Design a protein around this nucleic acid. Structure first.
Lengths: 843, 473, 146
RNA sequence: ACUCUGGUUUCUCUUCAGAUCGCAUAAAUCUUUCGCCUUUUACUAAAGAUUUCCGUGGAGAGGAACAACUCUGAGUCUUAACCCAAUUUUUUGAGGCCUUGCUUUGGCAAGGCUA
RNA sequence: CCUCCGAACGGUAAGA
């Protein structure tokens, strides 16, 4: 164990008291100083760990890929003890999460086991793509949001804004974030302002971090007889300071006075930085003496940036303002366990475990939720990582691990495992402990084998009522699709083993085996899949693996009503299922996928919604049978049977088979074996005879599949490819190059706007996901490395052309024109699936 | 300028500036230095011709050392990057034939997979990516703004910075029923640095020095040997300009190739005992110490080398041979075949002869400068010509042909400098005197040749004085 | 900055114009499927769709020119289909009659797309046969030149 | 606001050298391959391992030289103008008595008298 | 557009 400030046994004592614990996830955009902030925290807690005078420490960048690339790839936990303004120690469980958008899933894996989200914003950049995405995700996960504005030195040493303009920039950042939260929420208690203590201003490179409370406490310590809580309620906004009355007035004393925040906080910071970086030899000792800072002779000989860091560490001291923010605005596990169970527990808060866990009882029934899987040093075994929502997990205690498929009716997906050693992760050394009480974060060994991605650990034979926690909902969709083979086919087994391990390391990774024996990996972007394949080649499998050129996963839709009442007759030739297919209204699929409307609703509310906004027949709205291919699937199966033709009792005994067959038929797809998206199936004529033996599930489900395909194929089917949303932060002269690059890739620019308070421009555009391969590299090359872009899956858009136009010739090495694209994309997909070339209506 | 350049004016062109001043250097041994910010700013401004306008490493995307290592390990060359030989030869890259996994009719092509992609993400776009290096992904764009006017305040809202939008303030505090006295600070309470000004005249310069190339972002440091400063290393580390001829482009690529090879083959120096040659020599009674003009000691070295080779010749009784003072072996008369075979020296004698010829040329250019025949600008041009035309002035390439590698380099640098020099009002013709580039190359050549030549000449001189220093069946 | 915004805005305008052109081309390729339909007749009939306002940055001249180009391309596709179907029957040669072709290509959808009546169809078949005879003459000249 | 401590340069030597010894970059040897090839060198260019050379840092030792003197560290790092103060210390009226009950006396607890 | 221009030896009549 490396030497720290606090006792390790004191940390274990802090473990028991759930009130003295905060579960905090540090999220934000790419390279907004999240890892450097944790570096500063580690330096504050660990005396013997210090940042190099030239290179960043990157304590939580523990993967070699992370160290070389410079981008955080996987979330890393640090459990530290931090003092607040009052000096009371707290146990902070911090999730240093990647800022790259392709690893948004990783952030989600930390947002499940976290009560509060500290969102880092670059002061020079502002609100970016991943910032907005994570605001939406954290609010919709019902988490307490606290914003922290990192890299405020860039406003001083790099942008050189006047302090009033720096205040305006910070105010703009805060107001924009508040607007974002208000857009995606209903509460008025989710408003952010440093007046309330929701915002810290920091520069993690120079170890600056302060709220208004901490700076007011610095003033109180240097002067005395100052209520720093009452003083910090006035260091923000248009409140000015009259020195005649020694008062704070909302009106301007003079005609050219400054804000209180500028006078008392920003201006001293500017002067500190200016005296350190410009007058280090002339007026620096006098300035430091005025601040009560004494540096040695060997410390004044340092370079300007190490000296700035040292000076700001002597002045500000410790990150007590950050701890104040996370204590006063992020609920403790005991306080915050009720909404967490309300949101992420299948049984809800109304069960006998929805209240035994909502109290966060350290000595109740053991219920832990593991959502991360961290590799061992060699890379053979794994350690699950998760939050102990109830009970006290012990080392050696056997537990019942429940997978995502465990339900009460079907209990096949469970296993009794032996908990090996338990660790507390501080991201580079694991404190091995004997037990972990509730409300904490724990590393568990031995239980990894039955865990695929997320698991619920409970007591064996303890709670037969114990359900599973809801599986992780990811912000984006795995779209990019690579195919992998072993170089030596005899080594195909080993690759499979490797393909399992990565499947545990990456929460959004979607590995599978297709019909033709292909091993297909689904990821979110080029960097995501590059890291996946680095880990699959170097870390786990340690073999030679060939990659295919990446493609995207298509979907299938309709554009017109099916010309014929497409009918299917069962093999017994007594049931006649006659349906049509037509597209849903614009945006209805978005409502279905976002859980705006749910199948769990009563028919009353569902019909009320579908009559309110979509103008249907209430008979048809009440008759909406199923959402496909899943409960959230953006496909609708509307029953359009007449009341006087097919009796409800005659049809209710066969509705279930029709529903399941429709679900799996839309899951498969008849064009190129892809999900059918945005389709409405009106069951017109369901001739079901009398005998219950002739209308069984094996009699209907394949017939349901057949009628679904027949209705689909006659409704002018079309291919739909995913479209990514791209934000480019480019200099003003490199916008024409961005336009030229996006022109070559079928991409159109939604907007190009200058960034307020920065010389840069933001170009927001839409680009086809199949055309976005190497788009970032091309954009950075064509703009001399200046235009940087992040790509995220946004929506689905119809591929140009008719997929079934069999009069289209395809030359195998030429980018086809748009009207042929849908014909091309289907055929080469089918050949990859191992299917027939032409789609025939006769099946 | 006595006003602008005051911090450096009185010591700028001294041989070893500030050596006597203990405020700046440790002492006469000249190991450490510690300057002030105004001096650093003046030096940085005076050197702004040999430095880069880049404040960020983002310019070197797919053009840094890691990208080059990856491209070398993949037998691929980025546009403007160096070409190498393949690492893995005995695995044929076209031996992979049309199987069902690489089926052309199975893959969709809309945008060709350029070699830039295969190096940005080597594990995704390449099969068998052995010995590939992951390039640094991205550094946040430095938005530092260089100001070319000291009259501007160190802090000011630059017109380049885009303006910020209008007002918004949601502060719904309780409307106080005002019969009260509100918050008041103590009497002696004031902002932390009310006395100090917001910005002085050295603040903007220090901020600019933050975003400055090494060593101008330094405050102190260690002295380096004059040959260890390449001074043009960042010129071929950037992309070649647009309308350059083919020779200049290939010169950039070859300089880049040798930079990559030096960075890749670099091994840490080995631990060893501190052997010093000249300290041992001075410890004897046969060596004295003095302080001589460099031109004088150069003439002494030239004369000593001539005398020493001439003694080597006259020892073997070769009166028909004549070593001239430009170090040219000459036949006095038409020599018989028996005389020609007895006048056949090894590559040791001829390599020493040609090295002494180059030294004689350099020292003789300096002597021509000191005699007043040739002035300083033409002296620098002559040295630049000498160090870039060793293949023609001397002939050591025919006794150690590997040094042709140096010659090509000295030509490559000649291009790199010339097309940075002969731009604008400056055309072709002589005049460039930036001889540091080739001088470094020939010094580093001598660094490796010194042990080889010393061994060869030791063997030869020991031989002059009767000294030396189907298997299995 | 004035130069900079002038440069940015002109390319923004060009991008919007070309995107509108591509959208109109997609509308033309998705709806119009017969070369016998008039350009302005469809323009007065296809304006009742949803994306018919995609030409908000276009005039009647550009739309009519694009419709003419699409009609020409469709006619070329139909003619190519007719020529390809004319390469299957053995009776089609350099000296075939149109009266016999009216039964050889009686139920010919490619030829029907080429021409509804026998006059234009006979003219097109005669032009194709003349091209085939020219190709045979070229083959004879190539053989006799050696 | 004070008492005890106490340097810098330069030369040489002996060792340890991870570290961008070196923000620079040479050569040789060996083993694999590579291009020529007509005999040796001299070569072409990639990998690995060795050395050699131009340099470097740390520690210790011995000298010569502004060495005779600060600075740094440690140490509690000394006091009278204007305040005798009305919630956790050393100027705060809180002070006592008896009854009752318990307890072996002693001692303990609730109540009253209170200027 | 193409600019990389190498070298030495394997060339001794043997005698008077």
């Amino acid at each position: 164990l490396p030497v720290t400030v606090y006792e390790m046994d004191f940390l274990a004592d802090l473990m028991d008291n759930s009130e003295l614990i905060r579960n905090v996830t540090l999220c934000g955009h790419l390279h907004h100083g999240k890892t450097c902030f944790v570096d500063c925290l580690i330096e504050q807690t660990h005396p013997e760990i210090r940042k190099r005078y030239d290179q960043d420490l990157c304590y939580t960048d523990i993967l070699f890929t992370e160290q070389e690339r410079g981008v955080g790839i996987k979330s890393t936990p640090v459990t530290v003890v931090l003092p607040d303004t009052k000096g009371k120690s707290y146990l902070f469980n911090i999730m240093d999460t990647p800022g790259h958008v392709n690893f948004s899933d990783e952030v989600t894996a930390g947002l499940r086991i976290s009560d509060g989200v500290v969102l880092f914003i670059d002061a020079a950049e502002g609100v970016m793509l991943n910032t907005e995405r994570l605001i939406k995700h954290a609010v919709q996960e019902r988490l307490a949001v606290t914003v922290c504005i990192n890299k405020i030195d860039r406003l001083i040493l790099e942008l050189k804004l006047p302090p009033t303009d720096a205040y305006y920039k910070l105010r703009h950042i805060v107001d924009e974030v508040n607007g974002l939260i208000s857009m995606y929420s209903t509460d008025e208690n989710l408003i952010l302002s440093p007046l309330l203590g929701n915002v810290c201003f920091s520069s993690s490179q120079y170890s600056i971090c302060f709220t208004l409370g901490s700076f007011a406490k610095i003033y109180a310590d240097t002067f005395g007889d100052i209520n720093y809580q009452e003083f910090a309620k006035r260091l923000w906004g248009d409140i000015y300071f009259n020195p005649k009355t020694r008062k704070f007035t909302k009106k301007a004393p003079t005609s050219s006075s400054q804000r209180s925040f500028v006078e008392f906080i920003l201006e001293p910071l500017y002067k500190i930085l200016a005296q350190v970086v410009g007058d280090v030899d002339t007026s620096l000792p006098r300035t430091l003496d005025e601040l009560g800072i004494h540096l040695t002779k060997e410390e004044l000989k340092l370079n300007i940036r190490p000296l700035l860091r040292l000076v700001c560490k002597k002045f500000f001291g410790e990150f007590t303002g950050f701890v104040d923010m996370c204590v006063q605005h992020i609920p403790s596990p005991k306080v915050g366990a009720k909404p967490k169970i309300e949101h992420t527990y299948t049984g809800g808060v109304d069960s006998d475990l929805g209240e035994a866990m909502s109290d966060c009882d350290p000595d109740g029934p053991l219920m832990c939720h593991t959502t991360k899987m961290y590799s061992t040093d060699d890379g053979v075994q794994f350690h699950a990582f998760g939050r102990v929502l109830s009970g006290t997990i012990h080392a050696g205690q056997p537990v019942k691990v429940l997978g995502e498929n465990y339900t009460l009716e079907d209990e096949e997906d469970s296993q009794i495992c032996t908990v090996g050693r338990l660790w507390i992760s501080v991201a580079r050394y694991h404190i091995e402990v004997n037990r972990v009480p509730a409300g904490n974060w724990v590393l568990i060994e031995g239980v990894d084998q039955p865990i695929v991605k997320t698991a619920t650990i409970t007591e064996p034979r303890g709670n037969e009522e114990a359900q599973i926690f809801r599986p992780l909902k990811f912000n984006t969709t795995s779209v990019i699709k690579i195919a992998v083979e072993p170089v030596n086919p005899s080594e195909l087994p080993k690759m499979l083993d490797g393909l399992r391990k990565v499947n545990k390391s990456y929460p959004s990774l979607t590995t599978k085996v297709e019909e033709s024996g292909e091993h297909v990996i689904l990821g979110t972007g080029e960097l995501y899949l590059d890291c996946v394949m680095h880990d699959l080649r170097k870390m786990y499998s340690e073999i030679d693996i060939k990659v295919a050129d990446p493609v995207v996963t298509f979907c299938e839709t309709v554009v017109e009503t099916s010309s014929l009442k497409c009918f299917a007759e069962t093999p017994n030739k007594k049931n006649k299922i006659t349906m049509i297919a037509e597209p849903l209204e614009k945006g209805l699929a978005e409502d279905i996928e976002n859980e705006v409307v749910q199948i769990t609703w009563n028919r009353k509310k569902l019909g009320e919604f579908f009559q309110t906004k979509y103008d249907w027949d209430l008979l048809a709205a009440r008759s909406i049978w199923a959402f496909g291919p899943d409960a959230t699937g953006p496909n609708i199966l509307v029953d359009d049977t007449l009341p006087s033709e097919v009796d409800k009792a005659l049809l209710g005994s066969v509705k279930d088979s029709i529903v399941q067959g429709f679900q799996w038929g839309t899951r498969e797809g008849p064009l190129c074996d892809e999900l059918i998206r945005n389709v409405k199936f009106k069951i017109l004529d369901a001739v079901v005879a009398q005998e219950p033996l002739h209308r069984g599930g094996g009699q209907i489900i394949p017939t349901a599949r057949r009628v679904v395909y027949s209705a689909f194929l006659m409704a002018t089917p079309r291919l739909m490819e995913p479209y990514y949303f791209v934000e480019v932060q480019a200099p003003a002269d490199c916008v024409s190059a961005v336009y030229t690059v996006l022109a070559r890739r079928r991409g159109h620019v939604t907007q190009d706007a200058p960034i307020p308070g920065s010389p840069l421009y933001t170009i927001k555009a839409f680009i086809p996901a199949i055309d976005s391969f190497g788009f970032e590299t091309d954009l950075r090359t064509h703009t001399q490395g200046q235009a940087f872009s992040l790509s995220v899956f946004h929506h689905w858009q119809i591929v140009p052309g008719d997929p079934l136009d069999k009069s289209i010739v395809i030359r195998p090495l030429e980018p086809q024109p748009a009207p042929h694209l849908a014909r091309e994309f289907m055929i080469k997909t089918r050949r990859r699936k191992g299917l027939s070339e032409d789609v025939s209506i006769s099946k | 300028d006595p006003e602008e350049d005051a911090p450096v004016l009185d010591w700028f062109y001294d041989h070893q500036p500030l050596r006597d001043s203990r405020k700046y250097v440790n002492g006469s041994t000249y190991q450490r230095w510690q300057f002030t910010l105004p001096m650093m700013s003046t030096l940085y401004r005076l050197a702004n011709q040999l430095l880069t306008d880049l404040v960020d490493d983002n310019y070197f995307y797919l053009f840094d050392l890691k990208a080059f290592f990856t491209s070398k390990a993949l037998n691929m060359a980025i546009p403007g990057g160096p070409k190498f030989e393949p690492l893995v030869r005995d695995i044929n890259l076209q031996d992979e034939d049309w199987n069902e996994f690489n089926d052309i009719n199975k893959i969709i092509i809309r945008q060709p997979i350029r070699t830039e992609y295969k190096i940005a993400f080597p594990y995704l776009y390449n099969n068998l990516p052995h010995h590939v290096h992951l390039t640094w992904y991205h550094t946040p764009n430095v938005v530092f703004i260089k100001t070319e006017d000291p009259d501007l305040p160190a802090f000011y809202f630059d017109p380049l910075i885009n303006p910020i939008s209008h007002r918004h303030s949601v502060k719904s505090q309780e409307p106080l029923p005002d019969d009260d006295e509100e918050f008041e600070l103590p009497e002696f309470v004031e902002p932390f640095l009310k006395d100090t000004p917001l910005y002085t005249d050295n603040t903007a310069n220090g901020i600019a020095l933050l975003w400055a190339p090494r060593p101008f972002n330094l405050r102190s440091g260690r002295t380096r040997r004059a040959l260890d400063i390449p001074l043009v290393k960042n010129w071929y580390r950037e992309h070649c300009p647009a309308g350059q001829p083919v020779k200049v482009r290939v010169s950039y690529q070859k300089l880049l190739k040798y930079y990559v090879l030096n960075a890749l083959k670099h091994r840490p120096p080995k631990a060893q005992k501190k052997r010093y040659l000249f300290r041992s020599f001075k410890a004897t009674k046969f060596f004295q110490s003095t302080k001589l003009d460099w031109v004088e000691v150069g003439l002494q070295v030239c004369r000593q080398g001539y005398n020493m080779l001439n003694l080597l010749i006259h020892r073997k009784n070769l009166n028909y041979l004549h070593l001239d003072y430009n170090f040219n072996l000459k036949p006095v008369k038409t020599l018989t075949t028996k005389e020609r075979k007895k006048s056949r020296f090894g590559n040791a004698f001829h390599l020493c002869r040609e090295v002494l010829r180059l030294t004689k040329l350099v020292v003789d250019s300096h002597v021509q400068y000191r005699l007043g025949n040739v002035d300083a600008f033409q002296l620098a041009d002559g040295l630049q010509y000498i160090f870039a035309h060793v293949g023609q002035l001397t002939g050591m390439y025919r006794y150690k042909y590997k040094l042709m590698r140096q010659i090509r380099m000295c030509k490559d640098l000649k291009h790199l400098i010339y097309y940075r020099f002969n731009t604008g009002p400056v055309g072709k013709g002589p005049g460039c005197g930036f001889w540091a580039a080739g001088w470094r190359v020939w010094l580093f050549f001598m660094r490796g040749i010194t042990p080889l030549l010393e061994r060869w000449l030791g063997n030869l001189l020991a031989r002059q004085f009767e000294g030396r220093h189907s298997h299995f069946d | 900055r004035s130069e900079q915004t002038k440069e940015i805005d002109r390319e923004r305008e060009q991008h919007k114009r070309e995107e509108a052109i591509q959208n109109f081309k997609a509308l033309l390729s998705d709806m119009v499927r017969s070369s016998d339909v008039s350009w302005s007749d469809t323009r007065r009939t296809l304006r009742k769709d949803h994306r018919w306002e995609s030409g908000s940055l276009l005039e009647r001249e550009e739309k009519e020119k694009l419709f003419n180009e699409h009609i020409e391309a469709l006619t070329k596709k139909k003619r190519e289909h007719f020529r390809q179907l004319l390469d299957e029957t053995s009776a089609i040669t350099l000296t075939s009659t149109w009266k016999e072709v009216k039964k050889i290509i009686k139920e010919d959808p490619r030829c029907i797309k080429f021409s509804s009546s026998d006059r234009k169809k006979q003219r097109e078949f005669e032009e194709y046969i003349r091209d085939k005879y020219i190709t045979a003459k070229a083959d004879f000249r190539t053989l006799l030149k050696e």
